[PDB]
Amino acid sequence: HCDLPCGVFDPAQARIEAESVKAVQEKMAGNDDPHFQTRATVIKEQRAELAKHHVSVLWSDYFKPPHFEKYPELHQLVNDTLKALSAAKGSKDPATGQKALDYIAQIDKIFWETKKA
Amino acid sequence: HCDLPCGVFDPAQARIEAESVKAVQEKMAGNDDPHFQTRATVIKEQRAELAKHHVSVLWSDYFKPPHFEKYPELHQLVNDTLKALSAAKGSKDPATGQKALDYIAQIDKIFWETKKA
Amino acid sequence: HCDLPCGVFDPAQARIEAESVKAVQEKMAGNDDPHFQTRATVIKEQRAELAKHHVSVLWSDYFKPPHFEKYPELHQLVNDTLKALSAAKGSKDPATGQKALDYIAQIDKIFWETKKA
Amino acid sequence: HCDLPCGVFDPAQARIEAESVKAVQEKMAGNDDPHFQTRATVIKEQRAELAKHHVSVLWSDYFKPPHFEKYPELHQLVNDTLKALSAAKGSKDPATGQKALDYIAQIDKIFWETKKA
Amino acid sequence: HCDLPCGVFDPAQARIEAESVKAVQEKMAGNDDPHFQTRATVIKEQRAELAKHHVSVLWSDYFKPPHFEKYPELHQLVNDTLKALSAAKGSKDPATGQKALDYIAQIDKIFWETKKA
Amino acid sequence: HCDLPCGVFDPAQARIEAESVKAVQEKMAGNDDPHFQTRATVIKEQRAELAKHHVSVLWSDYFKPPHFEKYPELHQLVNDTLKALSAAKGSKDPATGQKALDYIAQIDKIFWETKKA
Numbered sequence A, B, C, D, E, F: 001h002c003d004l005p006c007g008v009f010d011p012a013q014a015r016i017e018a019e020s021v022k023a024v025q026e027k028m029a030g031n032d033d034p035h036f037q038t039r040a041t042v043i044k045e046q047r048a049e050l051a052k053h054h055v056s057v058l059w060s061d062y063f064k065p066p067h068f069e070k071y072p073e074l075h076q077l078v079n080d081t082l083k084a085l086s087a088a089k090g091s092k093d094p095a096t097g098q099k100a101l102d103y104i105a106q107i108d109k110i111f112w113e114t115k116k117a
């Protein structure tokens, strides 16, 4: 994931960050204190950006042309995932974090498929 | 490029960082001091990574589905640029820096078209 | 701008980040959602800080003593630009973003002159 | 892992970075090219520091007084893990990476036990 | 503080960042402007996290087994300090900043004792 | 130092980073192992950049126009300090770290003078 190549990649990195995004959204629903809301906004923004970086890294650094041929929809899937993450970043609705988790889950399925074969 | 959205994008950001990459490769042929070679290596890894970030952001944050219908080669183009920037990161040969610039120039051409219509 | 030296500089880097600052200020007048206001605030703080970094780097890493003899107001100009960017960071008023851009435009004019002779 | 608290933590974040460390060390044995060795060293330093951050965050933000009560050896385990990561930073021997991984595994078991309550 | 080892550490780095935390908290009592409160919250989060990094680095990179031997309460002191910093992150009350500072002062005395040998 | 303004500034931040630069230089003189040299180069580059950021921050964010009038040589002093730090960054000679420490010491003298009055 580090560009050597070192060869170690796992969508879990994108996932755990996007799970933090959703968790923050959930918490924001429970406590309207402006200072808390602000800190939640700060943290959500950071985690969502890290999730994007991880998803982008799988796409540029791990996935190769044979993968793009086998999965013609992967380019657009990655793009939509990144857009979903930016949508979650801009929203307090955990359903937006969940949508981005849903997309990452589709990438993860494909990822582990390429690991078998 | 900050994800607000703020709507301020320019592939010049990627290009300037990719220019630094090619310039650093060029300097590496000029001075065999191991300390200098190592600093050039540090700097090149960082600038190439920034270039990759700028390219990725254009793709995810600036380009939208209408652009992708109009330019069906754009997803693959962005993927190629990022892989070219990875190849430059791994190399001392300025030809690799140039190849990354050439891809960026193709993104730049598409980008300014989308600013017209 | 990486300090190798690589010799690749362009005040466009500062300018684009300062444009994002003014754009974010402009958006803040458009949408009173507190969550949106807070994200705009996060993003503006970051982009202004990047702009300040780019300006500082030009001053320390690109401009050299001959430039300072030729442009004796340049030190104070750079100081003013950075303080203008701090003032924009602290404000929602796009006039502050504009003032920072105006100073950057003066650095830009000096910069391109030094590229000629 | 972000400090809201959001309550999302997983020692897998430290693991994955430490796996990269070990993977780099192994790659260093098979390509004596000076530029490659330098890049491998640069990347290793980065990923080892990320792994440390993730371990430190678990210890400061996730683990709580009753955990330190139940596991009187946790403080020292976390300290030994961080030192094992620094030892891996300073070394090309994959045995050092592996030792860091063995420590993170001890943290991972404790972590998941604490999530059972 | 960088992990060479270079052997240059000073708890003053944590102190200065924690002093900023407390200074922000105090400033928050005197300007109820929503934008100012938001920026103060953003900056506080950043500086508290820097202070934590500096404290964590001391503990992992500077302190050694004989220090932990001589000061059996060091592990818990460092943990309490990090938690005090998180409490300051989450609060507008300068008493929380001050408590973080009082903990860093306990670390600072121990540090300087260990530099006497 | 954080741009609120919070009002907390201390040249010690620049100093401790520049002291790390010098310490690394000293160590590089003692151990010619290429892996160690590389890691030292990495670390020195990072610390020197952080020292520059701190010096630049005093200059833009702390020092004000009354200070520049009272100390007409301060602008150029800061510029030369930053250049000295970039010189140390590019060198393994600790005398270069010491020169940058010398310059910071001149800034520090002025800084504490402005704190009295």
Ligand SMILES: [Br-]
Residues within 6 Å of the ligand: A001, A002, A003, A004, A005, A006, A007, A008, A061
């Ligand atoms: Br890779």
Ligand SMILES: [Br-]
Residues within 6 Å of the ligand: B001, B002, B003, B004, B005, B006, B007, B008, B061
């Ligand atoms: Br945007």
Ligand SMILES: [Br-]
Residues within 6 Å of the ligand: C001, C002, C003, C004, C005, C006, C007, C008, C061
């Ligand atoms: Br340069």
Ligand SMILES: [Br-]
Residues within 6 Å of the ligand: D001, D002, D003, D004, D005, D006, D007, D061, D062
């Ligand atoms: Br937490």
Ligand SMILES: [Br-]
Residues within 6 Å of the ligand: E001, E002, E003, E004, E005, E006, E007, E061, E062
């Ligand atoms: Br150390």
Ligand SMILES: [Br-]
Residues within 6 Å of the ligand: F001, F002, F003, F004, F005, F006, F007, F008, F061
């Ligand atoms: Br300030």
Ligand code: NI
Residues within 6 Å of the ligand: A001, A002, A003, A004, A005, A006, A007, A008, D020
């Ligand atoms: Ni990797």
Ligand code: NI
Residues within 6 Å of the ligand: B001, B002, B003, B004, B005, B006, B007, B008, C020
């Ligand atoms: Ni933007």
Ligand code: NI
Residues within 6 Å of the ligand: B020, C001, C002, C003, C004, C005, C006, C007, C008
């Ligand atoms: Ni450069």
Ligand code: NI
Residues within 6 Å of the ligand: A020, D001, D002, D003, D004, D005, D006, D007, D008
């Ligand atoms: Ni978290």
Ligand code: NI
Residues within 6 Å of the ligand: E001, E002, E003, E004, E005, E006, E007, E008, F020
């Ligand atoms: Ni150090």
Ligand code: NI
Residues within 6 Å of the ligand: E020, F001, F002, F003, F004, F005, F006, F007, F008
């Ligand atoms: Ni401050």
